[PDB]
Amino acid sequence: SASDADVQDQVSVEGKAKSRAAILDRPSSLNALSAPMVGRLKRLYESWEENPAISFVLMKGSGKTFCSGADVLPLYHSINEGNTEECKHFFGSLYNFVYLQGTYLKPNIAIMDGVTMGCGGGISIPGMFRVATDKTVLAHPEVQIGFHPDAGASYYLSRLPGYLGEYLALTG
Amino acid sequence: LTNSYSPKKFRSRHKKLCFGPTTMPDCVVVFDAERKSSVVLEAAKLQIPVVAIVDPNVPLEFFEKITYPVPARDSVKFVYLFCNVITKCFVAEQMKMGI
Amino acid sequence: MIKEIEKDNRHSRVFVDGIKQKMMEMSVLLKQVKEPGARGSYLKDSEKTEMYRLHKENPEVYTVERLAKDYRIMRQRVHAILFLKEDEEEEERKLGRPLDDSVERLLDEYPEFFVSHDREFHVASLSYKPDFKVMPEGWDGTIKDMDEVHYEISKKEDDILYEEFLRRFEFNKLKWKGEVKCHKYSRRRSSDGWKITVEKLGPQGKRGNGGGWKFVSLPDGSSRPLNEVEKMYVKREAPRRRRKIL
Amino acid sequence: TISPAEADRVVRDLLAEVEKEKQREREERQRQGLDCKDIDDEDEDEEDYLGIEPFIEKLKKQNLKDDGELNRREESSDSDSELDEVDWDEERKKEDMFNKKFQRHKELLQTLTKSETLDEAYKWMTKLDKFEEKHFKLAPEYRVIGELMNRLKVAEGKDKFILQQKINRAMRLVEWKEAFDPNNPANYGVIERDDDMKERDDILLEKLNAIDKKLESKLSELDHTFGKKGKRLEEEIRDLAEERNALTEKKRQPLYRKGYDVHVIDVKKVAKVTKGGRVERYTALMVCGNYEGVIGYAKAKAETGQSAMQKAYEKCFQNLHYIERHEEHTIAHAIQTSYKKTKLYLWPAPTTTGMKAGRVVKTMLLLAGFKNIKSKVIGSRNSYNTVKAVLKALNAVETPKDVQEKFGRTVVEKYLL
Amino acid sequence: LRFQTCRLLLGNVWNRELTIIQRRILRRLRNRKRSIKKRKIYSKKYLTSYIQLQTTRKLSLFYGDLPITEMHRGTKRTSYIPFLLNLETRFDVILLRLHFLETIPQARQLISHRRVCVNKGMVSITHLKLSHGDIISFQENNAIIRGEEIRRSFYKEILVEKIIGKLLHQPLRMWRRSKTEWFHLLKTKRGCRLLLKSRFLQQLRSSMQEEDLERTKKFGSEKVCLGSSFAEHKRMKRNLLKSLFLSKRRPIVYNSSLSLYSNSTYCFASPHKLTMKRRIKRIELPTHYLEVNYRTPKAVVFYGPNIGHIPHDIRLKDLNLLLWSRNGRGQNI
Amino acid sequence: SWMKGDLLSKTRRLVGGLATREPVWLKAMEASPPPVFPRSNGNLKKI
Ligand SMILES: [Mg+2]
């Protein structure tokens, strides 16, 4: 259509010989996901899984940031204007996307060339292959904001050796 | 290689008599930098993979038929290192089948 | 333990003895699938006569579409079967003795002695002309199935073929009855003269996409709308917006 | 089969049966009144239900006109099956190959029932499983069609249509793979002689290895041996070399492939001048193909017109290319290419057009497996350059899959849009 | 006239009865055809001239002596598919397909001599094209003769062609002796119905059923059964192995299960067997586009023809030099 | 021959269409493909 041109630029698609790579392109909010971004990524990954002509898929971020998390300021304004359905639809979409990534039928590869916070690790770290650079920083500052490590962060943090998951989640 | 079934004849002390291989090889590892032999051309003619170490002054015609180029200067240490990696990898694979 | 391994011997026997009937039904499926829509079965005359009496005793429910769905043949074939059965029973009514069925019983009892190629449903013939279009890079969406598109094309062509067959066959049936002249020496003047079929040509006299409106204007000076015979003539002389199929 | 006496018995019994049925029905009607003028003189003499009496009078007189051998086999009237011209040796070989494999399976079963240790039973069942993986293995393509045929018998409406089309495509692909598998040795020939193949090669391999070891042992001692002992070692080495040459010549058995068609494009008479006259030789150019996308060509030179064709026939199967077709009848797009001065144009066509080409191009495309193509040759019409230009054009065509891989996008047929 | 064309085409293109001299000549001609089919590897003029001309001559003799090449070059299309589909809707072609007569010249005789009706319109156009909806019938003064002819023709194609090849491969002179006794049965309506109600023809029905079962295995038929019933064929060996472990750690059942396994793996993996005895050319019923009531007789057209259901005796490899058809899909392409 | 592509792609295209039997080295080449490096503009910078 003619109405989607912002989201097409926000989530760019790169094509290769037998692979497709989704590139996050939000420099203003440092690649913070929105409900349109999560819905578009869900449609893209569902179609790439459905296609037999694609062998594996990839996720990259553009700039100095991979993903700083999700958009909480829009949820804050939506709560302040009274309704909760936007927040509910955002959370169900994000958790459905994480579940699809965790039960994805093809190889998925996540490149991490920068900072990663919140659900930015939850969309990638259940993946089949995770590549980390020297500039990669992974942290969980949800307790300072008053939220919990959602989007499957209670899975891979809990399955760390020792009590390291408790340490990292509590101390950020 | 392209004619590995041609007859041979005994003559004298010569440079000693040797027949061809009974079995067609699956890979050819070359240590020819002066290009004295036609082994790359024959392997390209007969569709056989070639592992060889390439000089900076290799011709394009010889280069395009090399499947696995290793860009280096073939000093004695690097030739030893190359052959050592090859031998250790092959014997480690051989041990996995109990042999 | 011995009962558990006895039941397994019975369960292996019930496959080993019935291995051949599976090959019979699978041979029928292979004949159905090598030429799609072929039914592999050779519908018989006893089934035709059951179809005729079954349609005659209950026309309003056991209609032609129901008969075609039950007996897995074409609706054109069902119409031809019913018309020929009515002709047959009128022939036997005129004769007073039943007709000779020696050929028909020969084709009936021994279907493996001949070759038959009857068809269940219509499958369209496509031209596989190479013509493509490259999608954008950031595209999401499921492309259609070629079998689905072939199904849509075949359904559309079957509808067109069915209505064309009806328009030809009803006209031929009442020509068989005898309401249509079809001779130079049987079109004679009435006592008052000839009737005419006046057509309103031009873009303002258009009855729709295909032609112009029509009326009669009888020889006495009066005019009337069309009858059903005239309406059939109007329908059968119109142009058609398609290439010639079959 | 049925004996002539049995065939006479049945027709005499059937005539006696119709007579006895007439007699019993006449008596049954006579016992209830019912005078039988419809049984007499209507069922015996003047029925004539077919019009067979002229044929009776003709054949009865014709059956005695001449004499000869009453038992002589004569040629069949409704003959010309025209496909039954099959080399029966492979047919009578595969039956006992299967019989031997089935007997071996039976002996493995009868050893497994007679074992006594469960470790030995594990060994025997492993042996049986390794046997059934090599001689009784069902290809994985068949279980897909098995599941689809399970859905087909219960699907109706649109679903029957979709399943019938998909199983038709699967049938075509499995039939093609079975008929042209290169791993199966039953798809090979002996070419006029200029699982037994594997062991026939293996015994030659073992003999060659033994001869190599003996030759190495004698060559090791020739350096230190001097004199008449050296001379007798030289003679023994020469005899071994003659034997090994004779063994390595035998491994050169050319093979053709079954189902392939081979045609002659060109036979020329070329001449060379010497001081004693003209030296004349022959060259032949031949093409081959399997109607399913594989095409090859060869050129050879001999002294006679038959031997040139024989040499090119031997070498025709060593340079084989695969060509991609669009829906098994035409090329993906129009293509123009030139080889030297021979410029060649090819254009695709809809499905009911036919092939419009000259002799060389038409033969090459027919053997490759194309069905609806128009073509034109512009410039020089040398046949050998025409063959080369056709192979250049057929390999320069970009398929939609190739565009898909090159650009990373989706390539969709326009009628599926 | 016509048998000289068998020398031209090296086959049995003459549909009349052969004498002994003609059979002996035909043996040599078939030997010559067998020798020609071997030497195709050394011939340059094979595809573009020889086979094309032989198939053109065969089509000309099949359609009753018509200029096929001239009527095709009149149109501008290369492939023969629309020309042949259009040719299959001619009047005298349809009269041959319904088996109301024997030959295309006989149908031309009846149509030209003003004796066949279409929708009760008596027509005399031999080249008349029939669409779907047309009704073919005869004249009431000729109906009894045509019905007699149809009955004789079918009950003699069950005899002079059908019983002669099936388990009765007798010499020609023995069969000419026994054919009179086989004729004399067919003189009566009772002798026909008794011939139909017999165990002779029931055995010949069953043998053809098994032969047609066996011919299906060329297309990998027996492996479709394995793909259908792959679960139970695994459970049979599963039961045998579980028994062979359980009842051996602690033999009539062993022999029964071995016999069952052997029977199943024999019937599922025997290859296709080919015999010297040829399959018999049956008579085809054109039920895809014509509907017949054989009593009167009457026919009604209800569909178009198919290119693959024309009853010709030409190989597909030779005919695809003219049709250029993508065979296998079941469509008219 | 007249096919296009390097050794692995040409051999894969040949063995897919049942033209040649499968060579032994095909599986090892598929498990360990040859290396690739990006485009370089033909310019060497003097260190
Ligand atoms: Mg010129």
Numbering used by the authors:
A (entry chain f): 33 to 204
B (entry chain A): 107 to 205
C (entry chain e): 139 to 384
D (entry chain D): 70 to 263, 295 to 517
E (entry chain C): 17 to 266, 280 to 362
F (entry chain U): 2 to 48
What does the paper say about this structure?
Mitoribosomes are specific ribosomes found in mitochondria, which have been shown to be remarkably diverse across eukaryotic lineages. Among these, the mitochondrial ribosome (called mitoribosome hereafter) is an essential molecular machine that synthesizes proteins within the organelle. We used cryo-electron microscopy to provide a high-resolution structural characterization of the cauliflower mitoribosome, in translating and maturation states.
To trap ribosomes in translation states, we collected a dataset for mitoribosomes purified from mitochondria and ribosomes treated with chloramphenicol, a classical inhibitor of bacterial-type ribosomes. During data processing, we identified a subclass corresponding to mitoribosomes in a P-site tRNA-accommodated state, which we resolved to approximately 3 Å resolution. This allowed us to build a detailed model that includes the tRNA, the messenger RNA path, the binding site of chloramphenicol, and the peptide route through the peptide channel. At the PTC, within the LSU, we fully resolved the binding site of chloramphenicol, responsible for stalling the ribosome in the P-site tRNA-accommodated state. At this site, the first four amino acids of the nascent peptide chain were clearly visible. Since mitoribosomes were treated with chloramphenicol, we were able to resolve the antibiotic’s binding site, revealing that its mode of action is nearly identical to its binding in classical bacterial ribosomes. The ribosomal protein uS13m probes the base of the tRNA anticodon region with its C-terminal extension, behaving in a manner identical to bacterial ribosomes, while uS9m, which has a slightly extended C-terminus compared to its bacterial counterpart, probes a different region of the tRNA anticodon. Additionally, we observed a larger portion of mS86 in the ribosome charged with tRNA and mRNA compared to empty ribosomes.
